[PDB]
């Protein structure tokens, strides 16, 4: 970190080599065949809660690596996969998007790419004093996924898109008035999903991870993606590192081996 060590998605060092955990036996993300997932129906004792309220107090920044839009904890989830009675609270999204409309998502599913995932980050309240201190320890860390299409414009992410132009360099970070992670849900109605257990998908990569993977997609237009293609990995007037074109974008780490995992699906 401090010892010049920049991680990225072109050129650049094996994260293994640097991040030990990378090498662990459950990473993410991994591709998730539909047919291989196993019903359990005790997933639906307590049906998955996202509990979720407008953020005003909210950050998006470029860190060179992914959008960040930094939320305040208040949302909350729990249900589903998380154990009895704890409270998960949502402490950030992060955006991974392709370069073609072809690629982006971290997650395949039959092994179909999608335009972008983006990922509701929440740590258990219920353990631990703070994210810092679930991440890499059992039930610390929940992610949500969600597959993301092109299409029609996704209005609550307007507020984020409309300040990428801001926040084109590493580095840089904007405040917005108002984010509401609601809108990143699908319908209450369209709700499904898969569970695994897996790892962050950026360094240091710990394990732990509770990934909850909703089958229904949510759509943004062209001219939102457009947007995020633009984004760049380092700071303004840097000197390009030799096999890098200095543009964040196709920042999804490669699917990873299942091992002996169990993915588990909340419905039939
Ligand atoms: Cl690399
Ligand atoms: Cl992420
Ligand atoms: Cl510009």
């Excluded at 009675?85 to 992060?94: A, I, S």
């Excluded at 997650?107 to 990922?119: I, R």
């Excluded at 257990?197 to 993977?213: A, K, M």
């Excluded at 237009?221 to 974008?249: M, N, P, W, Y």
């Amino acid at each position: 970190e401090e010892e010049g060590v920049e991680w990225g998605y072109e050129e650049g060092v094996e994260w293994g080599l640097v991040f030990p955990d990378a090498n662990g036996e459950y990473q993410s993300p991994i591709n998730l065949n539909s047919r291989e997932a196993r019903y359990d129906p005790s997933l639906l004792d307590v049906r998955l809660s996202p509990n979720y309220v407008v953020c005003r107090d909210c950050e998006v920044t470029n860190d060179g690596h992914t959008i960040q839009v930094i939320l305040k904890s208040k949302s909350v989830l729990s249900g589903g996969p998380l154990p009895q009675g704890h409270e998960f609270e949502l402490y950030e999204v992060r955006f991974h998007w392709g370069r073609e409309n072809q690629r982006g998502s971290e997650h395949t599913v039959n092994f179909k790419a999608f335009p972008m995932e983006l990922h509701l980050i929440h740590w258990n309240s219920t353990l631990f004093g703070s994210i810092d201190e679930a991440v890499g320890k059992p039930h610390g860390i929940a992610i949500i996924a969600l597959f993301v299409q092109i299409g029609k414009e996704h209005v609550g992410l307007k507020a984020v898109t409309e300040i990428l132009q801001d926040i084109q360099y590493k580095g840089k970070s904007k405040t917005i008035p108002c984010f509401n992670p609601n809108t990143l849900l699908p319908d209450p109605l369209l709700r499904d999903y898969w569970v695994y257990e897996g790892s962050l998908t950026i360094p240091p990569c710990s394990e732990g991870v509770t990934w909850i993977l909703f089958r229904y997609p949510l759509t943004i237009s062209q001219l939102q993606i457009e947007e995020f293609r633009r984004l760049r990995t380092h700071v303004k007037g840097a000197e390009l590192v030799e096999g890098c074109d200095g543009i964040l974008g196709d920042n999804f780490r490669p699917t990873q081996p299942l091992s002996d995992r169990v993915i588990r699906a909340a419905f039939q």
